[PDB]
């Protein structure tokens, strides 16, 4: 059986569409990419043919097809359906305890670790990590999605293949490196560096919407307050690289022991030289540590 | 919205190191399944990344339909194509002669085909180079017109079977910077296949027995050391049989495989100019 039906769209954008389908009477989640965007269809086929990418924390892989008749092309990416949607959602309709924070941030860890390490799978970067593409599961944990632009490397072989997609990450979450385009483009280290950035961010929203001492900040993007909606490339670049900005730390985390380790984290992450930056490793270390 | 992906799969047509090959329906309607081997991988993403570049549509190039890629408790790769129920030009030659009708649509039709794979067009699609031109890689349509099929090796801007590689590729003198040289080494393939053609055209009614080329001077699976010394050391080429020259299209198809097989690529004639040559024989 491979017949699949498409039930619902629980997402539209630039990349294409996501679809609620059928399979066996189990829910899937069906991406037909927009043909602006088959680079990353195809580097995502490339990354889901490493048979050890399997985890909890990486969107679970069913099938990629690329359809066609006549000059019109599909291109299909099918994947296990994550009913409580992205962690932008959800955060959106829910504050967290210690527990829920933790579980949550320390699952987003353990997914990028498993990404960044080497097995003797290579090593990969994402490259566009941000909380839309971090899908909640009913189990408390979240799973890494969207490996369009991601990077491979094995020290093993000495291979780094860092594809031909032109597509960018998303602005909002650019490092400093990504903004000012000074990042060393056959450097593998530099891609990891923009992914511990990335999560940073991440770790702020979450924390953000943890409840301490009967207080918690509403749900907000990262650079919210700094930057126009809908930022461009050049407004990030002057609030991150010209006028040095990081996310505010809500002076009420200071007085929540678990906040406060979460604070020191994030900051970690965001320092100028991505050489400075915590590891994925150190980070879930850390995490595992913290309650 | 049913999307119904069920492929049968009905009769294996083809096995072997790439994986095999299966006569498939989906809808009633034929299709060929080309499931790939662990080894053969880099062939499936090859043929994939350039249909995902430029959807080549073409009377003779194999017609895409589909790459799928599915997880099972490893990752299948099948290539889904139009199903030519002839089979190749390869087994086709074994068990039928040709008179010079068919002989001719047959490579014209080739040389169509390679000649829309090297051209670029601007707007269009890159230039393509093959890379594995013989005559197990060409299929034969229920017209008499064949296509191109396998583009695992296709390049845009695994080795080729040795039996076909140009001098260049068994010397290692190709110019691997020029893409012009890719052309060359495909025409060079495409000579070959012009005399296996060739010698099953019945004239006087004499025909020869299909054999493949270089059948006489090597062993089969040949060395590439075997290939290097017949083609670069001592530069054989394939016998034009005396009764080639008592028929006038046998004797323009020997002045036109020469043209192919020069040791300097670049003095070989282009797809585009054998399809004029073609066009003005008979
Ligand atoms: C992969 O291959 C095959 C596919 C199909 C098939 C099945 N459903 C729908 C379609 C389709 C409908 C409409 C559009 C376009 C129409 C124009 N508009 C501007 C945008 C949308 C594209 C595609 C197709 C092509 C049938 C086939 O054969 C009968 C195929 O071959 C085996
Ligand atoms: C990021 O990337 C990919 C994600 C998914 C994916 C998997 N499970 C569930 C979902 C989902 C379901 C429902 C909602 C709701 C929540 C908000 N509400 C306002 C309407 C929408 C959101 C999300 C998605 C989007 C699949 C993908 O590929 C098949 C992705 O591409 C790699
Ligand atoms: C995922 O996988 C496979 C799918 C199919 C297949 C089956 N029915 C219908 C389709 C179809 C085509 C095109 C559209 C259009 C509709 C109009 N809209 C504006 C753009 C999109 C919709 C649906 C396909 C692609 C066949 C396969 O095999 C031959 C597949 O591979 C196993
Ligand atoms: C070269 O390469 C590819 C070829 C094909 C392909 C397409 N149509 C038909 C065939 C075929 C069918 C049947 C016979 C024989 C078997 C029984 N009888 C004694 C005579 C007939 C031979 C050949 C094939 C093999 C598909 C591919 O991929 C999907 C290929 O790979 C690119």
């Excluded at 924390?57 to 990629?64: C, R, T, V």
């Excluded at 000059?71 to 949607?85: A, K, N, R, V």
């Excluded at 670790?113 to 839309?132: G, Q, T, V």
């Excluded at 991601?150 to 032109?166: E, I, K, R, Y």
Aim: aromatic content about 10%.
């Amino acid at each position: 059986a491979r017949d699949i039906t498409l039930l619902e769209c629980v997402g539209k954008g630039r990349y294409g569409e996501v679809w609620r389908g059928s399979w066996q009477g189990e829910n899937v989640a069906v991406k037909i990419f927009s043909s602006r965007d088959e680079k990353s269809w195809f580097r995502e086929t490339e990354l889901y043919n490493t048979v050890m990418l399997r985890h909890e924390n990486i969107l679970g892989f069913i099938a990629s097809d690329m359809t066609s008749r006549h000059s019109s092309t599909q291109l299909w990416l099918i994947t296990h359906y994550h009913e409580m949607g992205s962690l932008y959602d959800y955060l959106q309709l829910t504050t967290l305890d210690t527990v829920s924070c933790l579980r949550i941030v320390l699952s987003i860890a353990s997914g990028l670790a498993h990404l960044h390490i080497e097995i003797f799978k290579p090593a990969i970067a994402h490259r566009d990590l941000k909380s839309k593409n971090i899908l909640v599961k009913k189990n408390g944990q979240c799973c890494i999605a969207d490996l369009g632009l991601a990077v491979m490397h094995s020290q093993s072989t000495n291979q780094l293949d860092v594809g031909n997609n032109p597509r960018v990450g998303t602005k909002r979450y650019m490092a400093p490196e990504v903004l000012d385009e000074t990042i060393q483009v056959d450097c593998f280290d530099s891609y990891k560096r923009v992914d511990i950035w990335a999560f940073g961010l991440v770790l702020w929203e979450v924390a953000r919407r943890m409840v301490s001492n009967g207080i918690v900040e509403d749900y907000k993007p990262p650079f919210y307050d700094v930057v126009p909606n809908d930022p461009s490339f050049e407004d990030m670049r002057k609030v991150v690289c010209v006028d040095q900005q990081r996310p505010n730390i809500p002076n009420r985390w200071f007085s929540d022991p678990t906040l406060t380790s979460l604070a020191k984290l994030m900051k970690e992450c965001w320092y100028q030289n991505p050489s400075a930056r915590l590891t994925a490793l150190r980070i879930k270390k850390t995490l595992t540590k913290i309650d």
